[PDB]
Amino acid sequence: NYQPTPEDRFTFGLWTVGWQGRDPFGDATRRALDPVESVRRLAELGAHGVTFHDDDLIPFGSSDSEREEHVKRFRQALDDTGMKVPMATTNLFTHPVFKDGGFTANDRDVRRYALRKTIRNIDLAVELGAETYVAWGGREGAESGGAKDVRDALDRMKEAFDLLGEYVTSQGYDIRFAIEPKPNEPRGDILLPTVGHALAFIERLERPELYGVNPEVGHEQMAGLNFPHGIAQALWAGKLFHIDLNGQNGIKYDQDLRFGAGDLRAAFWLVDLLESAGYSGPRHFDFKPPRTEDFDGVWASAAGCMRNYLILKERAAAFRADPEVQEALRASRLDELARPTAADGLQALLDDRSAFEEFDVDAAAARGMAFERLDQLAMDHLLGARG
Amino acid sequence: NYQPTPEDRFTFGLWTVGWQGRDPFGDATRRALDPVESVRRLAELGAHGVTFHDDDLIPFGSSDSEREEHVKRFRQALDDTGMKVPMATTNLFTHPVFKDGGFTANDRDVRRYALRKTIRNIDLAVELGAETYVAWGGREGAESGGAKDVRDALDRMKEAFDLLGEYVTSQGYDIRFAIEPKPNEPRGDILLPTVGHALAFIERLERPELYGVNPEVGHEQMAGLNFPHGIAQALWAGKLFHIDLNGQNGIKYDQDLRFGAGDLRAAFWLVDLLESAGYSGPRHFDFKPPRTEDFDGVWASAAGCMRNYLILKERAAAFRADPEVQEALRASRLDELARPTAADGLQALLDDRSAFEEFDVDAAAARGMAFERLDQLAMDHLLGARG
Amino acid sequence: NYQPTPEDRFTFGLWTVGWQGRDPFGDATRRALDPVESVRRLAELGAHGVTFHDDDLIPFGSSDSEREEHVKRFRQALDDTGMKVPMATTNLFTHPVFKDGGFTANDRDVRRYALRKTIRNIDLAVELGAETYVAWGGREGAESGGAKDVRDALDRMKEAFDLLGEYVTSQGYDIRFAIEPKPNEPRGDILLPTVGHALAFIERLERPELYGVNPEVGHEQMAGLNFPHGIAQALWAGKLFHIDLNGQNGIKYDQDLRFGAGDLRAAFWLVDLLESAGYSGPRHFDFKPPRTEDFDGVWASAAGCMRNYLILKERAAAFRADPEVQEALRASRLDELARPTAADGLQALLDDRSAFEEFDVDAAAARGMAFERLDQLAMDHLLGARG
Amino acid sequence: NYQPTPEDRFTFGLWTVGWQGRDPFGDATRRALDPVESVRRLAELGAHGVTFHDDDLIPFGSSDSEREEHVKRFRQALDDTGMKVPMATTNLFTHPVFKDGGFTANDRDVRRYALRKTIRNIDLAVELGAETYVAWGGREGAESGGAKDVRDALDRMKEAFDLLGEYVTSQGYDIRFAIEPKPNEPRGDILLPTVGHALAFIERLERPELYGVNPEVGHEQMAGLNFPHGIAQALWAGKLFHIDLNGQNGIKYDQDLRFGAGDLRAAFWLVDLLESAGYSGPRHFDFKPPRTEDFDGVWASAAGCMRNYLILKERAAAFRADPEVQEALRASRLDELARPTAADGLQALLDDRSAFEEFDVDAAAARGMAFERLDQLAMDHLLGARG
Ligand SMILES: OC[C@H]1O[C@H](O)[C@H](O)[C@@H](O)[C@@H]1O
Ligand SMILES: OC[C@H]1O[C@H](O)[C@H](O)[C@@H](O)[C@@H]1O
Ligand SMILES: OC[C@H]1O[C@H](O)[C@H](O)[C@@H](O)[C@@H]1O
Ligand SMILES: OC[C@H]1O[C@H](O)[C@H](O)[C@@H](O)[C@@H]1O
Ligand SMILES: OC[C@H]1O[C@](O)(CO)[C@@H](O)[C@@H]1O
Ligand SMILES: OC[C@H]1O[C@](O)(CO)[C@@H](O)[C@@H]1O
Ligand SMILES: OC[C@H]1O[C@](O)(CO)[C@@H](O)[C@@H]1O
Ligand SMILES: OC[C@H]1O[C@](O)(CO)[C@@H](O)[C@@H]1O
Ligand SMILES: [Mn+2]
Ligand SMILES: [Mn+2]
Ligand SMILES: [Mn+2]
Ligand SMILES: [Mn+2]
Ligand SMILES: [Mn+2]
Ligand SMILES: [Mn+2]
Ligand SMILES: [Mn+2]
Ligand SMILES: [Mn+2]
């Protein structure tokens, strides 16, 4: 059971399985993977596709012809396997020139360079068939309060994304942008640190319809936030364009554990939500096989990502289909939450004495919500302990 | 030095100095304060004004005539002292009926009751001259994932605020709404948990211009977020309608320490920002004198709030006026952050070979940002150690 | 399946199911429970026993004869049901007199009073057959740095516990003490904030053998610590005298969720450890049924505590009995971790050239730990997805 | 003012100022520093000394004669400048062989290698005159629960430290060990994660007198703990052998900011404590100049460490010498905290009716602690705002 196939739409970044294990306190524990080899290994495990930063696919500073050759070999592997490229992104974080940011570097020349590097990869992404272009502003931020005027920085951020929107519109490209929040690391505080901040920012862009969010499980958890709540807000706004799936154990460094590790209950409620809402985008994993692992462990970790999603999907589906759960949901008045509070309108509400003057506050207060019983039914379903 | 006067616009909630010291593990340590007495004591310390929830001023369940009498006595104290009431709010959290929320309770009758309780206090607030009406959804949330469908809850939240907006518009009242985020406590996760989430939500209301945010120092810090960054985003959006000032030591329960306690450097950078941006609203303190304190300690704690703001204001002003700091800010290219990245437009950027083909990436990378020197000048100014 | 019986040794505090739902922002949602009624309800659910603070059983300020009568009625219920009282504790936190602590209050008279209140309840506990007496220093701490000289406070803490040890020794009582850490709440920082700090402190008492720890799942998680690691250290030291079981979602206020809620994987690894190590003490639940719940929800929440332990016990047992897991544990060299590094002694180690001069560092480095495969087998067992 | 001299005993690790700026998301921004150059630059800024890991001074895998030459050149720089080497440590974290630990690696051969690498550097440290040898178990831990049996791991940890203690005793070396805790990073959870856990562990070693702690400001703050409280416990136990000074903004990745940055009030209370208790060891800075900085910024950041200590020292000293503060400390009964609760003994306490039967609980409860006034005097002193 729980065998993935390409129709489950599981995708992986090249940088995930290709992570060599260099951390801030130690050297690489694994050799570099050829992108072609990752493509084939992932196809064999049942993945749908891969994603890339520019610099994962084409070594930084490659000539135009080295570049052609890298793309050609990759494209051949995609053709041989049937793997897709639904998303791409830019590396605006590794090279030293990006030490104070890309789009919001204090140096204007760096900001211009960041835009040009990005635009060149948008052309490549469209050529490979990507529908979503992710921006992760990992260096946009500060360690000290005087270093970054945040209002000016947001003006620069909006300028950058507006220009990118003008570019795609002018070229007639069919690609949308997704902003990936993260609250900190590697900068002390990162700009647009949560899904909320990103959603609010998007509404001030010149063409807000071209921009959504790419939330990551572990990033929101680094701020102690409820990830399924955040995703529900993004879905409610119509802005869940892509998602990064992984695990995280609490408020600490960005662990990027395989999906299902970390906060397992939150993973269950995330799956429940994605599947109930009909999210139809890629189930993308942004994870790092731990540096303890050899190559066999790398592939085992990747497989476990997919396995854990398909297990949780089954459990959530059983939960929602259970008539005893359906009855519980009514006992807890989930049905009533979905009805309008005042479809009769404001004047009717104001004239309704059962809403205030004659509302029996004590009787309403005495009614239990029956949430603990509901939650235990959810636990029993997750654990497969329904007698 | 550092004596406040009413022109500094310092305000306090009645619930702040009036907090009796009941916590989840212990009984009250102080007797209840009469609102009239708080008004006079605060006027003597140099405050500008007070704020209230409905239930702080009028005991829950008062008759129409007890209500009149409470308001009359309060109004007399305001007239005797010259104190203003710039803000008011509703208690939709204390009474048991609000155990699952007000605006987003699963029970529809409770939601209607929450709206009616709110509207009655909006009329009172306008009569007392409040310009801002705060909403803190402290019970809107969940302890378990199945208890609250978050999409439906946001539909209900938007319904409630839309109706309030219709009400104020229809009455011709000159009052705006400010949403006060908090990430958790007393619910396991609270809806709209940060300034970002609140800002994004506001953009989906029918009349977004009537709604802003009332961010609180300690609340954003409960998610480990940078408070001055959050306020800069709110100012950038034009939505900083009011602010709650206090202190918080990290990610834990909501401490509500006096302003300046907690993260002192963040307090300095907040003051710097508010004063540089010309925020002209109330400097409102939402703090709890610790339960260790008697009445003399209560007034000492309140006075310290004001004192610490005026000290930090002086230090920030000295920082920004220091020519050596002005030179540092140029050395760190803050000037350049404020200039447009590409006022020449997209086509010019694309044709500019100095932005990419001929950009010397190594030379740009080698340039230091000089941020540590700048930050030490900021430290020296804060500490009054400029030789 | 998963029906508890008294032989599973599940115990509950009277304050758990008896929590009325008063939180720092709201009033009680449930009426007070008679201790006799809790005893009978818990006996019917299959619990083994109950625990109490002095003030849960005997209202503060009771006369000697009211006291007798309270104890008599409780004792009758214990006799009627077969319920035991394995643990007792003192309330040194609720009454205002304890606002700055009990054992470490700055006022010496309060400290003496705290000792006398404690000793009176130790006599009661011994009469009811308790084997463990818990001390939770919830008020021992500070909100500000100058308020508490911590060295003097630790001298006072050690003085208090030494005196209690002298008391029990002098009376010939067969009772041991267990210190329950918590890092913060209701004080800004609490003394002995983690299991580590408590263990270290115990070693400086005059009779360290009489003192152990009473760690609580949610408390260690409030500091972002791994609870099963902490318990392993306490077991290694021979100091796990009692345990508090509950759930907690990350670094925030003390939630006291039912056991199994919160961090579900950590619950699995805790059960695995307790059962593998042969912990033979009570499985005590210190939880709060959420205030959303009526009485039916209270009992459902309590039942779920027990259910979730018995499910996890079964899953952990299946994990460790699985031959494929046993083989995995060898592949990951858990066997080798259990062997002495240098049973040959220091000189032999120093003369062993295969340990250094001729150690092939590259070959050792290339070996994968196979941890991800092991962890996925653990996941599959937890979820009941072993094909 | 605030010019350091070698008598202030400020020390720096070679790895601090020598950090090249490689982080988990980016390449180095600065070239490698020769240790000789760091020694001379630091001597010019007024430092007392430097500290080293084996691998900072002697490139891993050096021959015996390269090794001699590295040590000779370093020793010459020490002789030229008058700089001391008070502390040394081992790198048991960088090389891939240490991916699962040094002392607690599951592979027994790695554990033996870790011991031999350590012993070789203890000989070097003694030759250079170090009095303290630090052990930071950065790789001792796990990402998953099944990977590390923690009891066995602690047996292995104790074995390793016992053997080191036997080694130094047998050689007659005058050097003590200090364990440096950290709660996580680069492992998901690290063993002995706080000062408490380390202190408790030390008490189970064969010769506990040879072992103390090397607490780091930012590490304890990564668990949300109060650093001055932790240090007070270490001083109370007589185990503060060395300290790492730096700054950290809350619960996140290990920032290693310059001292005084981060939580500035905690820095003030730490300085107050160190100076009041007469700590006479090195004031060692374990900080990372941010990667935004060039070499000029590196030296500015290092200088700021020292400056900020000397400013805080002056402010704390002024605080404690202020007669108005001395009077406040009596008003808050700090004097009484320092007196024994029951120097009269247990029987006298039991017979003292003023301790219980006739204690007026209400009168004691009504007395305010006056802590807020005290804390504001502390604030005013820190800020230099005493009129
Ligand atoms: O944006 C693409 C990716 O870039 C980097 O690898 C980030 O660490 C990751 O979280 C993000 O998803
Ligand atoms: O909204 C008004 C106030 O209501 C409550 O007292 C909250 O605890 C507080 O943070 C908020 O500012
Ligand atoms: O010590 C007994 C109990 O006292 C209080 O109720 C605490 O909140 C709880 O954690 C502790 O277990
Ligand atoms: O133990 C010596 C040092 O080793 C490493 O550099 C650690 O990151 C640091 O915290 C520690 O102080
Ligand atoms: O470019 C205008 C900008 O200039 C600043 O005052 C920089 O000093 C900003 O805070 C504002 O967005
Ligand atoms: O009222 C329509 C709503 O109904 C739900 O499906 C409730 O099941 C929501 O998730 C959506 O906002
Ligand atoms: O009672 C002796 C004690 O006195 C203090 O100096 C109080 O000033 C302590 O820090 C020490 O433990
Ligand atoms: O070496 C004895 C050790 O063996 C284990 O059971 C390993 O299975 C430990 O938990 C204990 O410390
Ligand atoms: Mn991540
Ligand atoms: Mn990601
Ligand atoms: Mn607050
Ligand atoms: Mn507030
Ligand atoms: Mn608890
Ligand atoms: Mn407990
Ligand atoms: Mn560190
Ligand atoms: Mn350190």
Of the CA atoms within 13 Å of residue D4, those in its CB half-sphere come to: 25
Residue A204's domain spans which residues?
1-387
Ligand 6, residue A232: give the atom nearest the CA: 10
Contact status, residue D85 vs residue D78, Cβ threshold 8 Å: yes
Per CB-CB distance under 8 Å, the chain D contacts of A222 are 252
Annotation says A56 is catalytic: yes
CA distance linking residue A196 with residue A202, whole number of Å = 10
Contact status, residue D94 vs residue A26, Cβ threshold 8 Å: yes
Bridge partners of A88?
A52, A133
What SS3 string covers A271-305? HHHHHHHCCCCCEEECCCCCCCCCHHHHHHHHHHH
CA distance linking residue C104 with residue C152, whole number of Å = 9
CA distance linking residue D264 with residue D246, whole number of Å = 11
A8 labelled ligand-binding: no
Element (H, E) at A50: strand A49-53
Residues sharing a CB contact under 8 Å with residue A305, sequence separation 6 or more, in sequence order = A10, A12, A245, A258, A259, A260, A285, A287
Three-state SS at A219: helix
**Structure resolution, Å:** 2.0
Contact status, residue B190 vs residue B137, Cβ threshold 8 Å: yes
**Encoded tokens for B247:** 């202190």
What SS3 string covers chain C? CCCCCHHHCEEEEHHHHCCCCCECCECCCCCCCCHHHHHHHHHHHCCCEEEEEHHHHCCCCCCHHHHHHHHHHHHHHHHHHCCEEEEEECCCCCCHHHCCCCCCCCCHHHHHHHHHHHHHHHHHHHHHCCCEEEECCCCCEECCHHHCCHHHHHHHHHHHHHHHHHHHHHHCCCCEEEECCCCCCCCCEECCCCHHHHHHHHCCCCCHHHEEECCEHHHHHCCCCCHHHHHHHHHHHCCECCCEECECCCCCCCCCECECECCHHHHHHHHHHHHHHCCCCCEEECCCCCCCCCHHHHHHHHHHHHHHHHHHHHHHHHHHHCHHHHHHHHHCCHHHHCCCCCCCCHHHHHHCHHHCCCCCHHHHHCCCCCHHHHHHHHHHHHHCCCC
Q: Which of B48, B54, B55, B56 is catalytic?
A: B56
Of the CA atoms within 13 Å of residue C228, those in its CB half-sphere come to: 26
Query: Phi, psi (5° rounding) for residue D341?
Result: -65, -35
Q: Give the number of B-C residue pairs with CB atoms closer than 8 Å.
A: 100
Instruction: Give exposure, C240-276, as e/b (b: 16+ Cβ within 10 Å).
Output: bbbbbbbbbbbbbbbbbbbbbbbbbbbbbbbbbbbee
**Encoded tokens for B57:** 């001023």
Protein residue with least CA distance to atom 6, ligand 3: C15
Element (H, E) at A133: strand A132-135
Contact B337 A152 (CB under 8 A): yes
B180 labelled ligand-binding: yes
Of A1, A256, A228, A378, which is closest to residue C380 (Cα–Cα)?
A1
Cα(A181) to centroid(ligand 9), Å: 10
Q: Which residue in the set A27, A185, A292 is minimally distant from D95, CB to CB?
A: A27
Per CB-CB distance under 8 Å, the chain B contacts of C22 are 24
Instruction: Give exposure, C196-234, as e/b (b: 16+ Cβ within 10 Å).
Output: bbbbbbbbbbeeeebbbbbbbbbbbbbbbbbbbbbbbbb
Other Cβ atoms within 10 Å of B310 Cβ, number: 20
Three-state SS at A383: helix
Contact A290 D98 (CB under 8 A): no
Q: How many domains does chain B have?
A: 1
Technique behind this structure? Answer: X-ray
CA distance linking residue C128 with residue C122, whole number of Å = 10
Identify the contact set of chain A against chain D, taking CB-CB distances under 8 A.
Answer: 21-29, 93-96, 98-100, 138-139, 143-144, 147, 184-186, 188-189, 222, 249, 251-255, 257, 261, 290-292
Q: Which residue in the set C296, C301, C371 is minimally distant from A292, CB to CB?
A: C371
**3-state DSSP helix/strand/coil percent for chain A, to nearest 5?**
50, 10, 40
| B179: Cα separation from own chain's centroid | 9
Contact B112 A198 (CB under 8 A): no
CA distance linking residue A150 with residue A187, whole number of Å = 14
**Encoded tokens for B41:** 């004591």
Q: Is the CB of A180 under 6 A from ligand 1?
A: yes
Cα(C102) to centroid(ligand 7), Å: 19
Q: Is the CB of D68 under 6 A from ligand 8?
A: no
Protein residue with least CA distance to atom 7, ligand 2: B136
D244 labelled ligand-binding: yes
Phi-psi region at B307: left, alpha or beta (left = phi > 0; alpha = psi -120 to 50): alpha
Q: List, as residue ranges, the binding site of C for Mg(2+).
A: 180, 216, 219, 244, 254, 256, 286
- Count of helices and strands (H, E) across chain D: 16, 10
Contact D24 A22 (CB under 8 A): yes
| C192: Cα separation from own chain's centroid | 14
Query: Tokens 């103390």 sit at which residue?
Result: D212
CA distance linking residue C171 with residue A14, whole number of Å = 70
CA distances from D343 to A52, B30, C112, C160 (A): 72, 33, 11, 11
Q: Which residue in the set C307, C311, C371 is minimally distant from A293, CB to CB?
A: C371
Q: Are strands C49-53 and C84-89 parallel, antiparallel or unpaired?
A: parallel
CA distance linking residue D348 with residue D355, whole number of Å = 10
**Encoded tokens for B93:** 């959290």
Per CB-CB distance under 8 Å, the chain C contacts of A290 are 371-372
Strands (E) across chain D are located at: 10-13, 49-53, 84-89, 132-135, 141-142, 176-179, 189-190, 211-213, 244-245, 283-285
Sign of CA dihedral C106, C110, C112, C114: negative
Query: Tokens 């460490």 sit at which residue?
Result: D305
Q: Is the CB of C151 under 6 A from ligand 7?
A: yes
**Encoded tokens for B280:** 């002209």
Of A223, B252, D265, A257, which is closest to residue C223 (Cα–Cα)?
B252
Identify which ligand lies nearest to the alpha carbon of C236: 8
Q: Which residue in the set D262, D367, D387 is minimally distant from B1, CB to CB?
A: D387
Cα(B261) to centroid(ligand 11), Å: 13
Three-state SS at D384: coil
Cα(D342) to centroid(ligand 13), Å: 31
D286 labelled ligand-binding: yes
Contact status, residue D208 vs residue D222, Cβ threshold 8 Å: no
**Encoded tokens for C247:** 């759930």
CA distance linking residue A166 with residue A162, whole number of Å = 6
CA distance linking residue A271 with residue C40, whole number of Å = 41
Protein residue with least CA distance to atom 8, ligand 5: B338
Three-state SS at A307: helix
Residues sharing a CB contact under 8 Å with residue A327, sequence separation 6 or more, in sequence order = none
Residues sharing a CB contact under 8 Å with residue D136, sequence separation 6 or more, in sequence order = D89, D93, D180, D182, D214
Contact status, residue A322 vs residue A381, Cβ threshold 8 Å: yes
Ligand 7, residue D236: give the atom nearest the CA: 12
Active-site annotation of C, residues: 53, 56
Per CB-CB distance under 8 Å, the chain D contacts of B385 are 1-2, 311, 384
Contact D300 B366 (CB under 8 A): no
What SS3 string covers D120-154? HHHHHHHHHCCCEEEECCCCCEECCHHHCCHHHHH
Phi-psi region at D61: left, alpha or beta (left = phi > 0; alpha = psi -120 to 50): left
Other Cβ atoms within 10 Å of C380 Cβ, number: 21
Three-state SS at A124: helix
Per CB-CB distance under 8 Å, the chain D contacts of A28 are 96
- Preceding amide of A186 cis, omega within 30: yes
Q: Is the CB of A19 under 6 A from ligand 1?
A: no
D interface test, pick of A219, A222, A253 with most D CB neighbours within 10 Å: A253
**Encoded tokens for C187:** 């004080």
The CATH number given to whatever domain includes residue D62 is: 3.20.20.150
Q: Which of A56, A100, A263, A272 is catalytic?
A: A56
Of D283, D162, D179, which is closest to residue D234 (Cα–Cα)?
D179
Three-state SS at A249: coil
Of A115, B270, B252, D309, which is closest to residue C183 (Cα–Cα)?
B252
Residues sharing a CB contact under 8 Å with residue C327, sequence separation 6 or more, in sequence order = none
- Helices D64-81 and D108-128, packing angle to 10 deg: 40
CA distance linking residue B158 with residue B179, whole number of Å = 12
Phi-psi region at D20: left, alpha or beta (left = phi > 0; alpha = psi -120 to 50): alpha
Q: Is the CB of B143 under 6 A from ligand 6?
A: no
Q: Which residue in the set B170, B277, B341 is minimally distant from A112, CB to CB?
A: B341
At residue C51, what is the residue type? T
At residue A163, what is the residue type? L
Please return the burial class of A25, using the count of CB atoms within 10 Å of its CB with bins 0-12, 13-18 and 19+: middle
Of A235, A286, A298, which is closest to residue A259 (Cα–Cα)?
A286
Of B234, B286, B223, B221, which is closest to residue B259 (Cα–Cα)?
B286
> Which 8-state DSSP code applies to residue D177?
E
Sign of CA dihedral D1, D3, D5, D8: positive
Please return the burial class of A1, using the count of CB atoms within 10 Å of its CB with bins 0-12, 13-18 and 19+: exposed
Other Cβ atoms within 10 Å of C300 Cβ, number: 23
